[PDB]
Paper text:
Ras proteins are capable of producing a diversity of signaling outputs by binding to effector proteins, most importantly to the Raf family of kinases, which activate the MAP kinase pathway. The switch between the GDP- and GTP-bound states is accompanied by correlated conformational changes distributed throughout the structure of Ras. Two segments of Ras, referred to as Switch I and Switch II, undergo substantial rearrangements when GTP is replaced by GDP, as illustrated schematically in Figure 1 (for a comprehensive review, see Vetter and Wittinghofer, 2001).
Leu 120 is in the guanine-binding loop, with the sidechain in van der Waals contact with the edge of the nucleotide base. We found that the transition between the R and T states can be triggered by one of the hotspot mutations identified in our study, [name]. We determined the structure of wild-type Ras•GTP and the [name] variant at room temperature, both crystallized with the same crystallographic lattice, and found that wild-type Ras•GTP is in the R state, whereas the [name] mutant is in the T state (there is evidence in the electron density for a minor population of the R state, with an occupancy of 20% or less). S. rosetta Ras adopts the T state, similar to [name], where Tyr 71 is rotated outwards and exposed.
Numbering used by the authors: 1 to 166
Amino acid sequence: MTEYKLVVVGAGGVGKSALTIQLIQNHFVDEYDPTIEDSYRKQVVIDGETCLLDILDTAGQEEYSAMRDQYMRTGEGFLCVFAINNTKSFEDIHQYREQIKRVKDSDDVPMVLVGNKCDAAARTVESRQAQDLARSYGIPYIETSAKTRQGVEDAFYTLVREIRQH
Ligand SMILES: Nc1nc2c(ncn2[C@@H]2O[C@H](COP(=O)(O)OP(=O)(O)NP(=O)(O)O)[C@@H](O)[C@H]2O)c(=O)[nH]1
Ligand SMILES: [Ca+2]
Ligand SMILES: [Ca+2]
Ligand SMILES: [Mg+2]
């Protein structure tokens, strides 16, 4: 069966782990335990193909920025996550997209932009602003909530579909 190596990146606290755990384990993690580097595996059927997803959940706390480079090198596609109630996390995306281009040494890496926490009441990043950033990179934008599970499968499965176009 086909294996896809996916990496989830973005600032601290935006919900990378909650998104991943919703996908893999079908529950919402309410507490905040910062991640170092965790890996998950799951067999799924996507568009009639039996796939193995190997997901690397990375640290957003900038103390681990150096260790991240070597883990990210093996990734085939990246989920770049910000939170729609955290303007700085959106402004930080550009940096993660530069780190990816450095570790992969390529300008054409499969990637999806994810605006998480779309259940939150205090939105400061409008959908149009994120669509414009995604358009500049040539990638899809999807909004998610790890809390309600909205968009979670869509975000990960769209990333697989992007890997398949490359
Ligand atoms: N309301 C809401 N809260 C969320 C959502 N996703 C994550 N959270 C909450 O935000 C906090 C941080 O989530 P977490 O997934 O640990 O963030 P992270 O990006 O993995 N942090 P780190 O980079 O430090 O590992 C948790 O309290 C979690 O419940 C969401 O979609 N909606
Ligand atoms: Ca819970
Ligand atoms: Ca985490
Ligand atoms: Mg504004």
